[PDB]
Amino acid sequence: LHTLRYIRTAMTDPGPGLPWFVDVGYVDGELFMHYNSTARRAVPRTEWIAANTDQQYWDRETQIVQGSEQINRENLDILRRRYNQTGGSHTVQWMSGCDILEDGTIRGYHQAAYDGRDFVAFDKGTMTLTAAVPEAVPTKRKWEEGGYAEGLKQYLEETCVEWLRRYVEYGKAELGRRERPEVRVWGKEADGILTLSCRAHGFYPRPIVVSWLKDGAVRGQDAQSGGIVPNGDGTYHTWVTIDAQPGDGDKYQCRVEHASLPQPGLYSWRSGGGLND
Amino acid sequence: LTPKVQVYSRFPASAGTKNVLNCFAAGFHPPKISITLMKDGVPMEGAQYSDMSFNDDWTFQRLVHADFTPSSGSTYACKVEHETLKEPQVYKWDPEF
Amino acid sequence: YELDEKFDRL
């Protein structure tokens, strides 16, 4: 039900005018926290987090991620010498956070990846850092020496859970706010094949069921989707296409199932799509 | 891995009405990616690039959006450059599809 | 609320 995620990236080759280190925070899949190596500051991204937290909160977050930036800077140099790699593109990825399931079960996660492949993963049930690759064994030796397993256990089970419950309470109005999609039905004729398209513009929340219907019957297999893609303002977009015969286009209807709609919305090409209200 | 790209508008396209052209790329590694929004093969002004974020399988994703007014008889596209692509890939945006 | 920098050590 409720999730807290901290997405960290350390790069050797980021690109021109782009930061090498990026740290972003998410509450229920929505961005709220942001940090980059160029700005060197932890800043809010939503109105609900900024209005409910003071400057003292963002100061503690800045110094903790500034240190994380320095630690990951060392990690890129340590792992390149360990793997005996000579230049090129190398990436260190970090994933941290906790899930508060609807039944009350708490799941904790703290794992890393080197060059897009699993490196280390903390196992909460055994209190040990699992080394996925043979090059991740000296990392486990450093962890067993320091004894970070106990300090990480109390964070994922108590600290992470406490603050996620606060963020859920702060952003309850925004996360639960439903947004109706602007639907449009289109068609393209090519080599005796009529490709019908159905686009849903700016919907919230993210889960949606957009299906094609022929003579009032669902055509799941024949329909091709592009997945749920995000918009810059926070809303989502999706498109579903179907191959049909020319002169049969009006027999097809677009069905949209969403939380903002009390009943599934039916749309046709000739009726004007979403302009039919 | 090779990026999966799709180009779309924020609101349904209208004549001489302000909109936002979006270009989303996902499922790629390394994270270094060159994404360019074009207006008749010319890079569009004021392009906003999203912060580096990754999915379940550690594959990176980036959203590139720019405020624009769709002009009649103009072609809007998205150019993607990645080391796994060999040759640059261009994705066409259709206002009526 | 982010976790301490020492837990990012490799």
Residue numbers in the entry:
A (entry chain A): 2 to 278
B (entry chain B): 2 to 98
C (entry chain C): 1 to 10
Please give the exact wording used by the authors of the publication that reports this structure.
Highly polymorphic class I molecules encoded by the major histocompatibility complex (MHC) are crucial in the adaptive immune response to viruses and some intracellular bacteria, binding peptides inside the cell and presenting them on the cell surface to CD8 T lymphocytes. In contrast, chicken TAP genes are highly polymorphic, with each haplotype encoding a TAP molecule with a peptide-translocation specificity matching the peptide-binding specificity of the dominantly expressed class I molecule encoded by the BF2 gene, with the BF1 gene expressed poorly or not at all. In this paper, we find that two other haplotypes known to confer resistance to Marek's disease also have low cell surface expression and promiscuous peptide motifs, and examine the structural basis for promiscuous binding in three low expressing molecules. Second, we show that peptide-binding repertoire and level of cell surface expression are inversely correlated in both chickens and humans, indicating that this relationship is a fundamental property of class I molecules.
Crystal structures, based on heavy chain and β2-microglobulin (β2m) expressed in bacteria and refolded with synthetic peptides, showed that BF2*2101 remodels the binding site to accommodate two peptides with completely different sequences, including the anchor residues. Small residues bordering the groove lead to a large cavity in the middle of the groove, within which Asp24 and Arg9 can move, creating different configurations, as illustrated for the 11mer peptide GHAEEYGAETL and the 10mer peptide REVDEQLLSV. In BF2*2101, small residues like Gly68(human position 69), Ser69(70), Ser97(99), and Gly152(155) create a big cavity in the centre of the binding groove, allowing Asp24 and Arg9 to move. However, the two structures with the 10mers TAGQEDYDRL and TAGQSNYDRL display a completely different mode of binding, for which the P2 Ala does not interact with the MHC molecule at all (and therefore is not an anchor residue), with Arg9 interacting as a bridge between Asp24 and Pc-2 Asp. A further mode of binding is shown by the 10mer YELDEKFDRL, for which both anchor residues at positions P2 and Pc-2 are acidic. In this structure, the P2 Glu interacts with both Asp24 and Arg9, and Pc-2 Asp interacts with Arg9. These various modes of binding are presumably just a few out of many and illustrate the promiscuous binding of BF2*2101, unlike anything seen for mammalian class I molecules. In this article, we confirm and extend the finding that BF2*2101 binds 10mer and 11mer peptides with three anchor positions, with many different amino acids with different chemical characteristics, mostly charged and polar at positions P2 and Pc-2 (and hydrophobic at Pc), which is unlike any mammalian molecule described thus far. The structural analysis of BF2*2101 showed that this low expressing class I molecule achieves promiscuous binding by remodelling the peptide binding site in a way never described for a mammalian class I molecule.
